[PDB]
Amino acid sequence: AVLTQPSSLSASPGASASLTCTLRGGINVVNQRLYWYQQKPGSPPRFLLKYKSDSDNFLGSGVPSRFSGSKDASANAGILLISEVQSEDEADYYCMMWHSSAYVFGGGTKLTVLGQPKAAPSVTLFPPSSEELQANKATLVCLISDFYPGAVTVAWKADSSPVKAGVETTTPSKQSNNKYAASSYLSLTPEQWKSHRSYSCQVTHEGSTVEKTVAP
């Protein structure tokens, strides 16, 4: 790997984060022009700065001065310095350089800004529509959103007993505003749906369990 960045990095607000970009052994970092990009989910990456040395660098317009570049010849690495880290700096950060006739990026470092407050999930459960039943299929959709942190356990219950067959649950992903949302689908036969008093989606988050229930 030409360029290697750590997978993840966590820093407290008001702290500084030193994002590393380690160049392969046989390529000396002292001479290299390094470029750093910021990407938030749902958007293309965004140029931050070039850094070759204290005399040769480039800071993109509208990019905070809190972003600065440096190099660590000992570790043969480039460094992105984020000072006074803020919640809105949470993103994936990419280093990049030209080498062997191509731009190459590192794998991206995901910055986690610590100290975001808890938020209780909003859960809505939909039964199978008549249209889908009429089509001889049945899907329960449980939608979970507005919660932080993103660790959620989702359980389905046919009547009052656990159900694991036919379940499809997405990995919670941050919607805009840095909160999380997730989806869980329970597929049934129309007969399974009509032979039970009800089905339940149960979402446990931060010491609390929301349960919605639907029935025919």
Binding site: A158, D159, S160, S161, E191, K194, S195, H196, R197, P216
Partner: protein, 198 residues
């Protein structure tokens, strides 16, 4: 060409109590019994007076579909010549019954956390029911010497008792849905036949 509305009986969201068992008249249609015994969703499927092997090859004047719910271990009584609270006081088949009795466990639907007290059965009656007789009276039953009148008292029981249907009950005490098909073949042209009959 029209098929019989077995789905209106088998696929009914509401089942009556056994003491007030429901009956539906089926006529002028084709009863594809193949659809019934092909399904693996019935715990019991017993026919009397006619081999199930060749149900779809027969015709009948009229067919009655009786339906109700009873306790799992009470399914034995829905059969000719049986005894017990159900056969004696709630639903009685004739000794020479011609038809089929179909049942399936409905715990997932008819039970309730804490108990489904809407499914009742008759505990007492001054005499056994006649075949296909239905007794819905709620009058107080006198079990002793004193002729009580409208007041629950010693040896004066309220004739109906609720099943306590709960999901956690043993299999024997879980609710079962039963539909009795009676094949009525009178001295008149048959109006209900199977698919593969002449």
């Amino acid at each position: 060409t029209n098929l019989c509305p077995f789905g209106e009986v088998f696929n009914a969201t509401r089942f009556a109590s056994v003491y007030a068992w429901n009956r539906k008249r089926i006529s002028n249609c084709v009863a594809d019994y193949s659809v019934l015994y092909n399904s693996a969703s019935f715990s019991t499927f017993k026919c009397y007076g006619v081999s199930p092997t060749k149900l779809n090859d027969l015709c009948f004047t009229n067919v009655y579909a009786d339906s109700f719910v009873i306790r799992g271990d009470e399914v034995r009584q829905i059969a000719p010549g049986q005894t017990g609270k159900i056969a004696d006081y709630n639903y009685k088949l004739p000794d020479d019954f011609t038809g089929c009795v179909i049942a399936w466990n409905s715990n997932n639907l008819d039970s309730k956390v804490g108990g489904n007290y809407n499914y009742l059965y008759r505990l007492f009656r001054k005499s056994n029911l006649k075949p296909f007789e239905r007794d819905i009276s709620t009058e107080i039953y006198q079990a002793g010497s004193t002729p009580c009148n409208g007041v629950e008292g010693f040896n004066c029981y309220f004739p109906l008792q609720s099943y306590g249907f709960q999901p956690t009950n043993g299999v024997g005490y879980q609710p079962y849905r039963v539909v009795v098909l009676s094949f009525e073949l009178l001295h008149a042209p048959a109006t209900v036949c199977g698919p593969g009959s002449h």
